[PDB]
Amino acid sequence: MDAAIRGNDVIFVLKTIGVPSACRQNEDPRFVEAFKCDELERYIDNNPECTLFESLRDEEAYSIVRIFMDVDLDACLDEIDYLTAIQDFIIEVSNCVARFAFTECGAIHENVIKSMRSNFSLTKSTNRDKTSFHIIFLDTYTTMDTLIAMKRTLLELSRSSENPLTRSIDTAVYRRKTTLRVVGTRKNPNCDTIHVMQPPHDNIEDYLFTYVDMNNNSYYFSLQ
Ligand SMILES: [Mg+2]
Ligand SMILES: [Mg+2]
């Protein structure tokens, strides 16, 4: 933990793709709402058609986030290839982030490796025609500007890798005002596929990239 780094338990969600700036700013409940996690879980239960997108509420004021990736393989994998690819993916992505943190962020390389590999949540999209998931490194924190600075590094990783999952990292998600679709909710009123939670993580806070509650196991770094 660190005095200079405070947490966040207020989750800001957009209720559709492409919300105006004016509607985010005025927080029109038709388009956006801030929730505690228990409120968010209840809202999802009570709104079975919802399409929810987590976003930083005021990233000029506060932009601490968990490292996350949106993996977009528009192809099907054999089950065993997928399991092997996930494990190799974790190694490749953690090595890549740890090197960037070490050289660009004054970070402790082994703490990035350990925090990333030891605890992460995985979703699985129900679309069986592809291999889509979101990953949250629950205990590895940074700033959104650091993720933006790391965008080309991840792009180059996705180009050099032989791993089909690493190759499918969607680096366009690292940008200002970005969104991550909330697990269990739909993308749009016309597509009914969802991401489901995966063991061993079954609480919604484990699937949110703006939920920040560090403990001494947590590790934080940012651009130096
Ligand atoms: Mg995706
Ligand atoms: Mg994507």
Author numbering: 1 to 224
Q: What did the study's authors say about this model?
A:
Helicase E5 is a multi-domain protein; its primer synthesis and DNA unwinding activity are required for genome uncoating and DNA replication of MPXV. MPXV E5 is encoded by the E5R gene, the mature protein is 785 amino acids (aa) in length. MPXV E5 can be divided into 6 domains: the AEP domain, the ZnD domain (Zinc-binding domain), the D5N domain (a domain associated with D5-type helicases), the Linker, the SF3 Helicase domain, and the C-Tail. MPXV E5 belongs to the SF3 helicase superfamily, which normally forms hexamer and unwinds DNA with 3′- to 5′ polarity.
No crystal grew for AEP-ZnD, but one high-resolution AEP structure was determined (1.65 Å). Supported by the low RMSD value (0.6 Å), the overall foldings of the AEP domains are very similar in the crystal and cryo-EM structures. No DNA template or RNA product was observed, but clear electron densities confirmed that two Mg2+ ions (common factor of DNA and RNA polymerase) and one pyrophosphate group (PPi) were captured in the AEP structure. Since no PPi was included in the crystallization sample, the observed PPi should be produced by the AEP-catalyzed de novo synthesis reaction. In addition to the side chains of Asp70, Asp72 and Asp170, the A-site Mg2+ ion also coordinates with three water molecules. The B-site Mg2+ ion coordinates with the side chains of Asp70 and Asp72, two water molecules, and two oxygen atoms of PPi. Besides coordination with Mg2+ ion, the conformation of PPi was further stabilized by H-bond interactions with the side chains of Lys130, Ser132, His134, Arg181, Lys187, and His197. PPi in the MPXV E5 structure well mimics the β- and γ-phosphate groups of the incoming site (E-site) dATP in the MsCAPP structure. The similar structural arrangements suggested that the AEP domain of MPXV E5 follows the conserved two-cation-assisted, in-line attacking mechanism in catalysis, in which A-site cation activates the initiating site (I-site) NTP (or dNTP) by removing the proton from the 3′-OH group and B-site cation facilitates the reaction by increasing the electrophilicity of the phosphorus center. The de novo primer synthesis activity can be implicated by the PPi molecule observed in the crystal structure of the AEP domain of MPXV E5.
